[PDB]
Amino acid sequence: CELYHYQECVRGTTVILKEPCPSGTYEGNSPFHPLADNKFALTCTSTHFAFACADGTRHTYQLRARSV
């Protein structure tokens, strides 16, 4: 019921991710930026956020911001 995601991105750039599940609930350090096609956008910074899904699965994401 607990899945972990980890990915690196270039600090300052915009990251586009696919929602892990339809109409899931989100919680994180930055406001949610919903987009079309079950996706969402966020500015790359070292942070953590999570989604709670209807099937009981919780997805925790960790973004590692890096230079260059």
What's 11's domain CATH number? Answer: 2.60.40.1550
Q: How far apart are CA 21 and CA 1, in angstroms?
A: 13
* Nearest to 22, CA basis, from 61, 55, 63: 55
DSSP letters along 5-68, please?
Answer: EEEEEETTSEEEEE-SSTT-EEEESS---EETTTEEEEE--SEEEEEE-TTS-EEEEEEEEE--
Return the structure tokens found at 47. 């942070």
Q: How far apart are CA 31 and CA 68, in angstroms?
A: 25
Entry resolution in angstroms? 1.8
If one counts the domains in the chain, the total is: 1
Beginning with the edge strand found earlier in the chain, give each strand of the sheet holding 39-43 in spatial order: 14-18, 39-43, 34-35
Largest Cα–Cα distance in the chain?
38
Residues 6 or more apart whose Cβ sits within 8 Å of residue 36 = none
Experimental method: X-ray
Beginning with the edge strand found earlier in the chain, give each strand of the sheet holding 47-52 in spatial order: 2-10, 58-66, 47-52, 25-28
Domain extent, residue 27, equals 1-68
